[PDB]
């Protein structure tokens, strides 16, 4: 089935995003947002479905995505949360944009 072929290619996108090359801008998305440690009393009012690369990895390694589109939806959700919660001039936003540049480019190049 070409459904798991695409998902295996998405595991490579995930490895690329977690890789040491992109760490200057990707590290805020390694683990979930700790709203209590960052004193974001606001975060879970606005972000109803948090997402991060480690949760995406957990779901991928557990075969929880039925197809590549579900994986892409979660990665983009992680980006959309960051754009939604933060003021557009914050530099977590620039960091998220640099990482999304990696994701969208490698996703489009899927055979
Ligand atoms: C597992 C460790 O976790 C964190 C630890 C610490 C920490 O105390 N030290 C102290 C000095 C830090 N410095 C200052 C800033 N410098 C750009 C780099 C060096 C290094 C580490 C800070 C943030 C963390 N984790 C996080 N995870 C998601 C988000 C997130 N931070 N940022 C920040 C990342 C950098 C700027 C924004 C957010 C902050 C507020 C609201 C939303 C978000 C948000 O959207 N994301 C995705």
Curated annotation (Swiss-Prot):
Top-level taxon in the UniProt lineage: Eukaryota
Compartment list: Nucleus; Chromosome
Tissue: Ubiquitous.
Cross-link (Glycyl lysine isopeptide (Lys-Gly) (interchain with G-Cter in SUMO2)): 109
Residues in Bromo domain copies: 1-110
Domain comment quoted from the record: The Bromo domains specifically recognize and bind acetylated histones.
Involvement in disease: A chromosomal aberration involving BRD3 is found in a rare, aggressive, and lethal carcinoma arising in midline organs of young people. Translocation t(15;9)(q14;q34) with NUTM1 which produces a BRD3-NUTM1 fusion protein.
Family: Belongs to the BET family.
Role description: Chromatin reader that recognizes and binds acetylated histones, thereby controlling gene expression and remodeling chromatin structures. Recruits transcription factors and coactivators to target gene sites, and activates RNA polymerase II machinery for transcriptional elongation. In vitro, binds acetylated lysine residues on the N-terminus of histone H2A, H2B, H3 and H4.
Complex and partners: Interacts (via bromo domain 1) with GATA1 acetylated at 'Lys-312' and 'Lys-315'. Interacts (via bromo domain 1) with GATA2 acetylated on lysine residues. Interacts (via NET domain) with CHD4 (via KIKL motif). Interacts (via NET domain) with SMARCA4 (via KIKL motif). Interacts (via NET domain) with NSD3 (via KIKL motif).
Name of the molecule in the record: Bromodomain-containing protein 3
First and last residues shown, out of full length: 306 to 416 of 726
